Amino acid sequence: SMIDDDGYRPNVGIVICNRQGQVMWARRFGQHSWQFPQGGINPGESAEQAMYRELFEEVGLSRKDVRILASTRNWLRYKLPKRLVRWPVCIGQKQKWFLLQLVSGDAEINMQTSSTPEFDGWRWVSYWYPVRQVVSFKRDVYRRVMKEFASVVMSLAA
Numbered sequence: 001s002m003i004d005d006d007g008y009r010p011n012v013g014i015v016i017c018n019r020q021g022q023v024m025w026a027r028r029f030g031q032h033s034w035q036f037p038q039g040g041i042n043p044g045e046s047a048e049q050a051m052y053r054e055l056f057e058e059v060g061l062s063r064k065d066v067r068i069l070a071s072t073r074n075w076l077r078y079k080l081p082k083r084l085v086r087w088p089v090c091i092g093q094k095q096k097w098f099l100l101q102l103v104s105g106d107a108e109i110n111m112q113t114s115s116t117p118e119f120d121g122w123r124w125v126s127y128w129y130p131v132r133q134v135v136s137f138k139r140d141v142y143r144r145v146m147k148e149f150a151s152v153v154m155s156l157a158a
């Protein structure tokens with residue numbers, strides 16, 4: 001996307017859950033690190049629109065395959081490690097996060113459709129597992145996101 005005047009790129013992140021207290025966890029393409037889906041917001045896109053485009057392009061899913069259960073209100077920001085900034089200069093991302101319930105079958109997910117996929121593939125993990133597993137500079141964002149979505153996902157699991 002296009003960087004704001006503080007140097008942050010607008011982005012959306014997706015927490016997809018099932019009814020078993022689990023969330024969809026995906027391996028970064030060609031790496032050993034894992035994360036939730038996230039993608040940039042293009043000019044002329046709302047955050048919800050950008051979320052559905054990421055959902056289709058990197059997870060293979062339709063609006064019809066999910067239901068939106070929650071979203072974060074205002075931006076959550078993280079800064080890139082200084083060594084990973086590339087010289088507007090982008091120093092990090094500002095993110096809007098969505099909680100989706102998967103209602104179609106697991107087999108509807110297709111993460112291989114892009115010529116350079118965001119992900120190799122995915123698995124179900126326990127709800128809080130992402131917070132300690134994501135790369136360290138995203139941990140503060142992930143903690144706040146999972147703390148905000150926790151009550152909804154746990155209700156589904158009861």
Ligand SMILES: O=c1ccn([C@@H]2O[C@H](COP(=O)(O)OP(=O)(O)OP(=O)(O)O)[C@@H](O)[C@H]2O)c(=O)[nH]1
Binds near residue numbers: 032033133
């Ligand atoms: O299916 C898997 C499981 C784990 N991994 C990779 O293995 C790494 C370690 O995997 P884990 O952190 O899940 O388990 P652990 O037994 O090593 O540690 P504890 O939490 O139980 O103390 C993870 O951080 C991930 O990079 C995979 O790539 N795929």
Ligand SMILES: O=c1ccn([C@@H]2O[C@H](COP(=O)(O)OP(=O)(O)OP(=O)(O)O)[C@@H](O)[C@H]2O)c(=O)[nH]1
Binds near residue numbers: 084135
């Ligand atoms: O687990 C991780 C995640 C990210 N990184 C490193 O941090 C950099 C920024 O990682 P980001 O997740 O902020 O963005 P991205 O480059 O993967 O792509 P977009 O969401 O912007 O479309 C990545 O390019 C990678 O080098 C890691 O080393 N490990």
